[PDB]
Swiss-Prot record, chain C:
Entry similarity comment: Belongs to the WD repeat BOP1/ERB1 family.
Biological source species: Chaetomium thermophilum (strain DSM 1495 / CBS 144.50 / IMI 039719)
Function: Component of the NOP7 complex, which is required for maturation of the 25S and 5.8S ribosomal RNAs and formation of the 60S ribosome.
Protein name stated in the entry: Ribosome biogenesis protein ERB1
Top-level taxonomy: Eukaryota, Fungi, Dikarya, Ascomycota, Pezizomycotina
Oligomer and partners: Component of the NOP7 complex, composed of ERB1, NOP7 and YTM1. The complex is held together by ERB1, which interacts with NOP7 via its N-terminal domain and with YTM1 via a high-affinity interaction between the seven-bladed beta-propeller domains of the 2 proteins. The NOP7 complex associates with the 66S pre-ribosome.
Region (Disordered): 36-55
Amino acid composition bias (Basic and acidic residues), ranges on this chain: 40-55
Location in the cell: Nucleus, Nucleolus; Nucleus, Nucleoplasm
Superkingdom of origin: Eukaryota
WD repeat intervals: 129-159
Length: 493, 82, 159, 235
RNA sequence: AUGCCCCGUGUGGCGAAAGGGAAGCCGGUUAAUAUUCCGGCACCUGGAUGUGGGUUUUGCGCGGCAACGCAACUGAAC
RNA sequence: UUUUUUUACUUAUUCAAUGAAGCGGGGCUGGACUUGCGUCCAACUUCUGGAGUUAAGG
């Protein structure tokens, strides 16, 4: 029977704000952000914000109290404090002017700039974050997109170039596992870049690879948050690469030559020790020009099981015969704004389309200097009303637009009283089509009248929800009708 | 190739624009046969008739500050700076 | 290295854990050579380029490029991954049961008026004597006469 | 064009009209007792008359001459513990081989530090140059050193920073340092430094070392003093 | 949001079964307790979270000259 | 150089006030005298039992 205060119990204990969490954990905000990113802590939203904090806003972020306590028990805090103290000692030595002591303290400080590695050990962090290997495989899309992006991207103060090179080694080892196990199934080319979907141990993973060009760094971007995510994903990718190579039986890591990497063989530079998609392009030798992207074509052909692939020596090394005069080249992929009868000149778009469809499309449509068929995304699952470009417009079309198109193709009591007064004083098919259109109009009017009666019988909040659903469906049907109409225009052209 | 892909800027009409697309390099050169960033990197790597034009078109790279002549030690310096 | 999963014991997921929202799969629109019905007008291109940022519903415009060498890379490809980074740890995660029902399910089923006839359906008589608004009407209990009142102050009886 | 709906509303901070804006009140902060005590300690030492034996320590080396001295001293900084351990290990290797310690090692040349050691060197006339720290507390540990150096004929200089001298000798603080002997190539630099120290410091401070220090008044008291002097000059 | 900003007001505890104070009544029952048990019929405080209502597509309800009324009627610091 | 007298200074010491909030010296503006430009003296709120806070602006 003890009296209780209001703000003490319930959601107030269940949630705490980010300010209170930082003050409880005795941390700076960058350290708190790094810990949250590595541990997987995310804000969440309370049922009633006023119950938790009396002066609360839609802007403020609440956290789970057990998440904050678990961060408190995390042992990376002692490493953070030790590194802060060691940095203070290094600055003290540099100010006092002895460089030998500063270097001796730096070698304990274990800098990511000199190591090319994450500064802390995240192995146990990976262990609680992904308890099982299938969960680890499910969470790989963001990892692969991140590490391919930072393989492409320039280095900065937060992201060392040695660490970028280690990202490149890890992703190349992952690519060699993919082409060894043939684990890729889907490949897509888009204005975004190259989307790759691989099914590794029954889990579909799709990631984006940007095109080889100078990536724009305009605007405000924080590479420190990027660096934290990169360090986590490098640790995860290294461990999953080791497990995949151990499952395949190959030795990890694959030894890559520094001279070969300096030459630029990359996938050819990394060599792996022994200790229908394969049938597609199983026995064919393909040459690549300068304009063609050599490492995506080499990746997709090795994933499809191409035995030999060659390209220009300026593009890379560790390939087949770079000379086009060599008769061994069965096919050639070139996109230029010669004329060997043995060599079949075909498009990279044909390569993407063939690896998507497993059909080996004819090179006549994809001849150079000729317009190629439009490329299609394999990831799209068709649905009712979402519209399908592959589906015929005759197969899918609303009745009003169908009768309007039919009338356009054909073109390409009061009346009885007037007839009585007048007497006292192809085209039939078009008229029948107009009568069918009028019957459709009257049917739509009847349906609208029934809809209005039901809307009137609805209650107020149910009426508002019903109108919102009708508005959303009307927007979707409007976009679908616009797509169908301009597809009809393309068909007429 | 890493320097070209990382810090690549074009000097056109007294301006400093990045080499985001190969179409910009194609419009800049046009008649010399250089229409791609890969082609420009190849012409930089292997000396050709348009080497001087390619060097004039390519802006001087502004490397980040690291924290006699070298025969082969310049690669480590370039990796540390970029 | 060593693989972390020396011993894998199946652990039930806690109900408090909410997985991150997965990015949607790419559509037919995203391709560099899409079907031509996805392409917009130059008026739509100018509409976006006049429109403010984050007002547009979709972050990419339908673009068709003939050549891979003519394909330009995005100027915000770093930015979208940066936004994905910020959404992973900064955006709140909510478990919400979104309704997916037929809209006509909420509508009640009404009998047709043809079953419920007779009812008045068309105007058959007009009484015109009032220059002001007709305030009140009443019908004689015998059903013969009509009484009307108006703003003119005149009460009238009609057949 | 500007929106017509935006207008300026000035705030008049006169007496009794608006709430005063947040200004910098650092001049009037009620400080903690240790801060207040150290400030008043400095002020009291300024206000009282300082006898010449303490007031000689106000005059120190200038920046150029101090840097010129430190250019010589940094060549003769003593061995650190790691360098000493390496020297012991290398000499132990030679002794294990059987070679002589005279053969493997040579006479060291370092800056001499430690108060009793330096005082002994000055009395035995082995010191060539003596640098005495500005801010030794208690001051009695060094208050006799300029007079002892003048008695012994050793050139001397008072220099800012016992922490600066401790950084030379790999300590936190050194009260005094001495150069006794240098290598052959630095003998000319040492002689030039000693002559520069003489001409710059000692000739300048010979007149002012006998004078009493202190007597300086506060800012408001000083301003009252020029106001009364101006009134007297007008009268 | 590897830091920054805001505020002044101080300082804790004990001290009343007659002061202040959230909320329980009737009937019955024991050898002996009962506003405490039983039966019936209520109330207060604290918490979580739904449904139905209210508001909203022009965001934050209407009426009365008024005193004010109406089941709700956005409301952080100060 | 020392012994007495009074007569200035503030730092010892004593008293008081405050949430240690605007002290002192200049600068700007106005008014006075002066000398032909130095002083001193003032900037700001008075018919009303309302309100004054989260900076407007350049």
């Amino acid at each position: 029977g003890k009296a209780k205060k209001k703000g003490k119990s319930g959601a107030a204990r269940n949630y705490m704000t980010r300010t209170q969490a930082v003050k409880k954990l005795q941390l700076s905000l960058p350290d708190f952000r790094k810990l949250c990113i590595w541990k997987g802590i995310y804000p969440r939203e309370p049922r009633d914000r006023r119950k938790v904090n009396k002066s609360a806003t839609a802007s403020t972020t609440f956290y789970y109290t057990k998440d904050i306590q678990y961060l408190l028990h995390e042992p990376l805090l002692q490493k953070f404090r030790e590194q802060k103290a060691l940095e203070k000692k290094i600055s003290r030595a540099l100010g006092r002017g002895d460089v030998s002591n500063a270097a001796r303290l730096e070698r304990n400080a274990n800098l990511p700039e000199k190591t090319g590695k994450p500064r802390y050990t995240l192995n146990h962090i990976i262990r609680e974050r992904y308890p099982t290997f299938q969960d680890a495989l499910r969470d790989l899309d963001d990892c692969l997109s991140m590490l391919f992006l930072f393989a492409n991207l320039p280095s900065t103060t937060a992201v060392p170039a040695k660490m970028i090179a280690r990202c490149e080694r890890l992703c190349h080892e992952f690519q060699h596992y993919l082409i060894v196990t043939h684990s890729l199934r889907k490949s897509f080319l888009s204005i975004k870049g190259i989307y790759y979907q691989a099914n590794i141990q029954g889990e579909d993973i799709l990631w984006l690879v940007p095109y080889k060009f100078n990536q724009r760094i305009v605007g405000d971007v924080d590479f420190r948050i990027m660096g934290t995510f990169v360090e986590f994903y490098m640790t995860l990718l290294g461990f999953v690469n080791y497990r995949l190579y151990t499952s395949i039986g190959l030795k990890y890591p694959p030894k890559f030559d520094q001279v070969k990497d300096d030459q630029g063989a990359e996938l050819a530079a990394f060599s792996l020790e022994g200790l229908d998609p394969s049938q597609l392009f199983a026995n064919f030798t393909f040459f690549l020009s300068r304009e063609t992207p050599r490492q995506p074509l080499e990746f997709i052909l090795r994933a499809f099981g191409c035995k030999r692939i060659g390209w220009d020596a300026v593009l890379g090394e560790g390939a087949f015969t770079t000379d086009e005069s060599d008769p061994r080249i069965t096919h050639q992929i070139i996109d230029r704004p010669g004329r060997y009868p043995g060599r079949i000149y075909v498009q990279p778009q044909w390569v993407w389309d063939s690896i998507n469809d497993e059909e080996l499309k004819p090179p006549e449509l994809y001849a150079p200097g000729a317009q190629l068929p439009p490329h299609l995304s394999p990831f799209v699952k068709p649905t009712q009303g979402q519209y399908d470009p592959t589906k015929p417009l005759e197969e899918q079309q609303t009745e009003a637009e169908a009768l309007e198109a039919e009338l356009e193709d054909a073109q390409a009591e009061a009346t009885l009283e007037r007839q009585r007064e007048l007497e006292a004083e192809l085209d039939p098919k078009v008229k029948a089509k107009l009568e069918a259109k009028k019957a459709l109009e009257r049917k739509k009017k009847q349906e609208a009248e029934e809809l209005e009666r039901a809307k009137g019988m609805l209650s107020k909040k149910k009426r508002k929800l019903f109108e919102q659903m009708q508005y959303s469906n009307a927007k979707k049907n409007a976009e679908d009708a616009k797509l169908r109409a301009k597809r009809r225009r393309i068909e007429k052209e | 190739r890493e320097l070209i892909y990382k810090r690549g800027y074009g000097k056109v009409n007294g301006q400093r624009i990045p080499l985001t697309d190969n179409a910009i390099i194609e419009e800049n050169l046009g008649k010399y046969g250089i229409i791609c960033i890969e082609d420009l990197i190849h012409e930089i790597f292997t000396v050709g008739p348009n080497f001087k034009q390619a060097a004039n078109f390519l802006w001087p790279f502004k490397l980040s500050n690291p924290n006699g002549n070298r025969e082969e030690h310049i690669n480590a310096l370039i990796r540390a700076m970029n | 290295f060593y693989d972390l999963w020396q011993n894998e014991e199946p652990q039930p997921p806690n109900p408090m854990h909410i997985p991150a929202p997965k990015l949607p799969p790419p559509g037919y629109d995203l391709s560099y050579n899409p079907p031509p019905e996805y392409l917009p007008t130059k008026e739509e291109r100018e509409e976006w380029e006049k429109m403010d940022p984050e007002d547009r519903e979709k972050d990419y415009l339908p673009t068709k490029y003939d050549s891979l060498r003519k394909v330009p890379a995005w100027g915000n490809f770093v930015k979208e991954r940066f936004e994905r980074c910020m959404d992973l740890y900064l955006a709140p995660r909510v478990r919400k049961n979104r309704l997916n029902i037929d809209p006509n399910s909420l509508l009640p089923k009404l009998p047709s008026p043809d079953e419920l006839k007779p009812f008045p359906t068309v105007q058959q008589t007009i009484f015109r004597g009032h220059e002001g608004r007709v305030r009140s009407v009443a019908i004689d209990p015998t059903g013969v006469a009509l009484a009307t009142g108006g703003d003119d102050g005149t009460v009238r009886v009609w057949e | 064009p500007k929106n017509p709906l935006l207008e300026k509303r000035p705030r008049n901070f006169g007496i009794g009209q608006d709430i005063q804006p947040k200004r910098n009140l650092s001049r009037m902060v009620k400080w903690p007792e240790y801060i207040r005590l150290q400030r008043q300690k400095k002020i009291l030492r300024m206000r009282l008359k300082v006898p010449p034996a303490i007031a000689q320590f106000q005059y120190t080396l200038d920046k150029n001459l101090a840097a010129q001295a430190f250019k010589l001293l940094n060549k003769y900084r003593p061995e650190t513990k790691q360098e000493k351990k390496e020297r012991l290990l290398r000499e132990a290797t030679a002794i294990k081989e059987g070679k002589k310690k005279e053969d493997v090692s040579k006479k060291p040349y370092t800056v001499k530090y430690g108060l009793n050691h330096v005082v002994g060197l000055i009395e035995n006339k082995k010191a060539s140059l003596v640098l005495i720290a500005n801010d030794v507390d208690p001051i009695e540990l060094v208050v006799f050193l300029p007079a002892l150096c003048r008695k012994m004929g050793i050139p001397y200089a008072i220099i800012k920073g016992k922490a600066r001298l401790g950084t030379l000798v790999h300590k936190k603080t050194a009260a005094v340092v001495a150069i006794t002997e240098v290598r052959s190539e630095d003998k000319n630099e040492l002689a030039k430094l000693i002559s520069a120290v003489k001409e710059g410091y000692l000739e300048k401070v010979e007149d002012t070392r006998k004078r009493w220090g202190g007597g300086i008044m506060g800012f408001k008291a000083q301003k009252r003093e020029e106001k009364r002097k101006k009134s007297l000059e007008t009268a």
